[PDB]
C-alpha cells in the first residue's frame, strides 16, 4: 500500500503538468475565431504595415511562435507516455494487493 500511496503524489503531479501545457499551447496559437482575435495582437497590425513600407522590413516573430509550440507539443507526447505507463504500475500493484 505504501508504494501505491506514494504514487498518488507522482500520478497527480503529471496531469496538471500536462494540463498546463494544454492551456499554454492555445494562448500561443491564439483565439479560434480571428474575429474574436481582431485587435492589436495580429501580425497585420497598422504598426507592422507602416514598418513594411521600407523594403527588406518584415518579422521573424511568425517563426518563434512555431518554436514555442515545437517543444510544447513535443513535451506533452513524452509526458503522455510517462503518464500512461504510470497507470499500469498502479493497477498492477492494486491487483496484486488483492491476491495478498
Amino acid at each position: 500500500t505504501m508504494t501505491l500511496g506514494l504514487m498518488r503524489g507522482t500520478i497527480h503531479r503529471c496531469m496538471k503538468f500536462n494540463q498546463e501545457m494544454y492551456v499554454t499551447r492555445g494562448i500561443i496559437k491564439g483565439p479560434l475565431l480571428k474575429r474574436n482575435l481582431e485587435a492589436r495582437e495580429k501580425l497585420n497590425r497598422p504598426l507592422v504595415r507602416m514598418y513594411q513600407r521600407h523594403v527588406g522590413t518584415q518579422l521573424p516573430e511568425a517563426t518563434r511562435l512555431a518554436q514555442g509550440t515545437d517543444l510544447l507539443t513535443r513535451h506533452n507526447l513524452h509526458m503522455e507516455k510517462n503518464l500512461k505507463e504510470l497507470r499500469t504500475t498502479h493497477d498492477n500493484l492494486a491487483w496484486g494487493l488483492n491476491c495478498k
Binding site: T1, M2, G5, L6, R8, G9
Partner: protein, 44 residues
C-alpha cells in the same frame, strides 16, 4: 515511552499524501514520532 505525536505525525502523513485512515495508521507504524522532549580578539 513518551507517547506519540498525533499532530506532527498527521501533518507528515498529509505531506506524504496518505489520506485513508488505514494508510494513516500504517504510516504511524512505519514512522512513529514520539515526543522525546517530555524528559580571541583584543580590542580595548
Amino acid at each position: 515511552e513518551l507517547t506519540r505525536n498525533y499532530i506532527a505525525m498527521n501533518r507528515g502523513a498529509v505531506k506524504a499524501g496518505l489520506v485513508t485512515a488505514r494508510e494513516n495508521m500504517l504510516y504511524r507504524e512505519l514512522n512513529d514520532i514520539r515526543i522525546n522532549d517530555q524528559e580571541n580578539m583584543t580590542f580595548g
